[PDB]
Amino acid sequence: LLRRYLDYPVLWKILWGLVLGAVFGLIAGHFGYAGAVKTYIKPFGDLFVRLLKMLVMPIVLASLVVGAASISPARLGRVGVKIVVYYLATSAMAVFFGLIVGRLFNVGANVNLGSGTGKAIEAQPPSLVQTLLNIVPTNPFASLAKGEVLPVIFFAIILGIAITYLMNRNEERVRKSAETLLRVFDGLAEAMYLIVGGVMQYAPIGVFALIAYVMAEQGVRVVGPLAKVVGAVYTGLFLQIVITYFILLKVFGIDPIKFIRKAKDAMITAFVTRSSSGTLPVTMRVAEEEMGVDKGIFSFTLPLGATINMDGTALYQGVTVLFVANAIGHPLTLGQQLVVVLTAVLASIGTAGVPGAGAIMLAMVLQSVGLDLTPGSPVALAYAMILGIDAILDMGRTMVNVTGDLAGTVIVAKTEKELDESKWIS
Amino acid sequence: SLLRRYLDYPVLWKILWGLVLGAVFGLIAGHFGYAGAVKTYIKPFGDLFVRLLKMLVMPIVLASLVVGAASISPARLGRVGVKIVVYYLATSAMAVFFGLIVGRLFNVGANVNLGSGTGKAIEAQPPSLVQTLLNIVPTNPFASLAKGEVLPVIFFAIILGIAITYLMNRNEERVRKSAETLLRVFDGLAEAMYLIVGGVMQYAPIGVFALIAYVMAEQGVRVVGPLAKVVGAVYTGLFLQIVITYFILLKVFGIDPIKFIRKAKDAMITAFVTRSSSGTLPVTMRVAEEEMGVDKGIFSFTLPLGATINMDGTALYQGVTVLFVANAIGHPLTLGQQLVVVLTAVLASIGTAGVPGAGAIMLAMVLQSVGLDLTPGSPVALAYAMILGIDAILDMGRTMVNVTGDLAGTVIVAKTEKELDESKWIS
Amino acid sequence: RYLDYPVLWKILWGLVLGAVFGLIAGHFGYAGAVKTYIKPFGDLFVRLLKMLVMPIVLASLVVGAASISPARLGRVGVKIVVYYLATSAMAVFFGLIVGRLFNVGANVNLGSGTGKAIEAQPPSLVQTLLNIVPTNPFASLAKGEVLPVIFFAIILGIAITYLMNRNEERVRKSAETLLRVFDGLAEAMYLIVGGVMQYAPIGVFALIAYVMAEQGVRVVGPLAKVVGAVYTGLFLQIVITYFILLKVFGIDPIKFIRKAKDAMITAFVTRSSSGTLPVTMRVAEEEMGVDKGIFSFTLPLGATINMDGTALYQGVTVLFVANAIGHPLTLGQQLVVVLTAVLASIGTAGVPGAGAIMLAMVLQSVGLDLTPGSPVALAYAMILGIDAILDMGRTMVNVTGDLAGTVIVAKTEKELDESKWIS
Ligand SMILES: N[C@H](C(=O)O)[C@H](OCc1ccccc1)C(=O)O
Ligand SMILES: N[C@H](C(=O)O)[C@H](OCc1ccccc1)C(=O)O
């Protein structure tokens, strides 16, 4: 009778896992029991996170090669530039919403910071041209064996274009060899999609465990000013999803409610996994088999959007800037806010592919608007206070990042006349 | 007697000859005072052999494991399939466990002590067993290939093989063709690795000679006492394996074990005399057909699958030899990496070759998974050279229990399915 | 547009424009502007060229060694190693000759200071001969190591060609699909190289512009004779040694150079022989006519162990720092220089930064040690100032030697397709 578990449709099976995990974590971590949760429950969550991370590199390499090798380079270039301008616009609007909400909700009214060696991170912004040079891999195998997503994107696209140029050639040997290499990569991509199907069949347990641990450990650090911060962040995220993405899908024809009902599979995996590059397998599978997007559009726009299009992250940064500026007692004016917007939009590009860049971008936005992040200063104390409930903030903004990647893929597909209209209508 | 003739002598006996010649050469050149004269003019060949052996460890556990897992996957396992595969895996696990038990009991490799210290960076932090299990799933399979990890890539290869079979069972044409081609690529890689591991095993005599010569010249340690102890321990472990494992597994599934022994006598003797698990496949097929009583289907499907994935003798030999290496180089194994040895030996038993070097390579893989660097010069390489320089005796001993387990599993799967007639068993 | 031109001699007019504009930007004091707004293109080109070295080497070598008999492969290897040793020795000989000619390091006031002094860590020859065997081939691919990949690809290609001659069927149809995978990979890599050569003019221009900007102002006085000595040594090395070897083995010198102007100009600015491997392999196969059996096993090996212009620079630098600290050498010390230079070319292949270690060996072999504070570590810190403009040409010659030796071994092995060589 175990099969009923494995034979349960996973659409309304994740949400139940997530909600029951939230309830269990809140009723456990409120009675002083987070230790048993972290020792006996959270291993399942970490196993699920690692099971998802295991697929991100083979899936991106294989699917991207098979896609780019099935698309004319002109279409690939126009899709690239369209999705890039879309990503910049969405990050800008997300920081705009973040600042608007932070000013509205009056986040950080009286933070009442203490005294101590606050958390500080040396900004050290990598150069922009240096980052655009790091997109080219000095070694493709070393860029595979390091978890970097952008260099392998570049190499996979180049290899796909070369492979289709080969399959356009005239000599039988080279054409057959190109076809065989493409069949290898196709089999690899499809095997990875099947493994993703299996992992998502297992996913309710991992989602339960993860959300239970997260809402149990930090289910009590949400009080007073931290409660204000988490409320303002989640309100900004819900307003980004319900205003910007809804209007952008409604202006290009895509029905918003349908897109959300279909992306609820890769949304509740991001909201819990707390990594946009982690849930890349789930979102690529959902954009291929629940949206009807050509494998040349989503396979290019989802992995890139997993390292560039950070909307929830940009919103969290734009609102924690207001929080820290109100904590130190020197509020932000109406021009420094535009500087924050520009600097966040530019930092999302300047940290494209850098691992652990969740704090470098915040250091950039704080340095460019005068708030030096030198340690021991009150600004470091407020940033450490935020890093406190970060684990409960890092949940929603990952969901917003992945929903943004998906909405960008869907829009670029629909505007390029390669979106399956059959599985959209009812 | 040129080197062209040297390539026709059997590999395992060449290796034992090389180890004995290395013993006598080290003794002579150490008593005459030529230690520094063999650490530079003889040792490089041993280091070359170690670097040539450690190379095939990663491309084998990636390709061979994929093909293996793609030959036993649940996408093509009916009732008999799963019921024999769970048996093969459980018996391999209990065989590695018996290897560990009898190795710790006999205290294998305690009078060799060729290690520098009793621990400097190892045996200083406890690896959480839960966190050690969550290291099976790799956060990046290519990073676990390029970093030289054996268990994460084994898990990823198993998962890829199962996925590829589930693809090959798909009604579509493009994806089925793609899965066929990917499996053919991995099959070709595994086969090329088997060719290269045959060449390396042909080179292995000179490497074992150089390593043992350097050891016995520099250090006065002898490799006869502990090695006879390891031989005795592996054979006692095989005896305990047969008796305990198969007699309980039979008496629990309604079978008289004495008749099982008196009937599999033929296959046991011929496997012990041929030193090959597959070279005795016709004989064990005949014994299971006309002397045991199995029907054509079961003894035609399980016996080849058992010739491929079901290996207890090699599993027990690893469970004893990794413990010998641990107790030899100085710092023994914990309780959180004995299970890593068990898991790696088991999950590696599902992808095998049959080539002579199917124990040496599947022991380098274990020595890398549990974590014991085979770095050239490190005492792990020297103790592994010792334990590989006697592959003949252990091989001839364990090839018997391999096919013994094959027959026991075939008869078990038959008797839990009512397809073996009683006219051959009941008197 | 822009792609409508034969790039055979568009790289030349990229290079000349780059050199003149770099000299101008250096004369006018603008090195910052060029390094900040021009060198990005050069670095993009260098990375586009390095991106292919490992896949092109692996695939090309496997496909080649799976279509050649191991005995023919061994004969080819012996021939090419003999050639590499001979050319390294003769290059050091030419370096010493032209150094004594120009009186390198005749007089120069060093000036006491810190001075560059790298710790000479000389590995034994046996260690750098065992390091050719990879402990883990994927770890050798993921580390930029070319020689372990050479070994693994050679033995894998031989194993594949041994499988494709087996009476079995499931393995005969499975070791010919892996071979076609590697064939497709090598072909796609040659296509990507042919697509990068379109951008190669901008890259060459930017690279040589930056290099002639930041160094074109330092080549004055006693530091200006050493560059003349190195470049006259390189020109003499080519025009004498390579032309004599070619005209002896039948190959045409002039046609050879006119055929190599694609992988000499893109190595004279890439400043890395192991990085310009894709372009030189493509140019060998598609302009010289060598089959994938010779130019895939000899070209990366020559990019790793053959250093002709580098050894000429070692000879010139040895004579420089010897005549500059007031210590002239002798004929015997010069023979020592030559032999230690060849043995350092061999017994250093593989370790990163191998360009400052073999120099330490060829210096310690004459009595001048790289000790910090000593006059040698102050007389060599000065010759290191112009190392870019002194390394460009010697990388050019390090690659021209690879091409010449590949063509020599080919024409000796009848592999050289004689239809691509006469018009
Ligand atoms: N939550 C996301 C994630 O963990 O992937 C996000 O990741 C940080 C990041 C990493 C790389 C590039 C941009 C942003 C974040 O933490 O803000
Ligand atoms: N960079 C030059 C070249 O590759 O030709 C050469 O560098 C030596 C070198 C560099 C890297 C690896 C091996 C040898 C030199 O400076 O003379």
Numbering used by the authors:
A (entry chain B): 5 to 430
B (entry chain A): 4 to 430
C (entry chain C): 8 to 430
List sentences from the manuscript:
Both GltPh and GltTk couple uptake of one aspartate molecule to symport of three sodium ions.
To test whether this state could be visited in our nanodisc preparations, we determined a structure in the presence of 120 µM DL-TBOA. The structure of the inward-oriented protomer is identical to the ones described above, and is similarly interpreted as representing a Na+-only state. The structures of these protomers are similar to those of crystal structures of GltPh in the presence of TBOA (rmsd 0.670 Å), and show that the fully-outward conformation is accessible in the nanodisc environment. This structure also reveals that the tip of HP1 of GltTk moves as much as 24 Å across the lipid bilayer in the transition between inward and outward states. The asymmetric GltTk structure with only two protomers occupied by the inhibitor suggests that the concentration of TBOA used was not saturating, which is consistent with the concentrations of Na+, DL-TBOA and protein used in the experiment, expected to lead to ~83% saturation. In both cases, the tip and N-terminal helix of HP2 (HP2a) are displaced away from the aspartate binding site, and obstruct the movement of the transport domain along the scaffold.
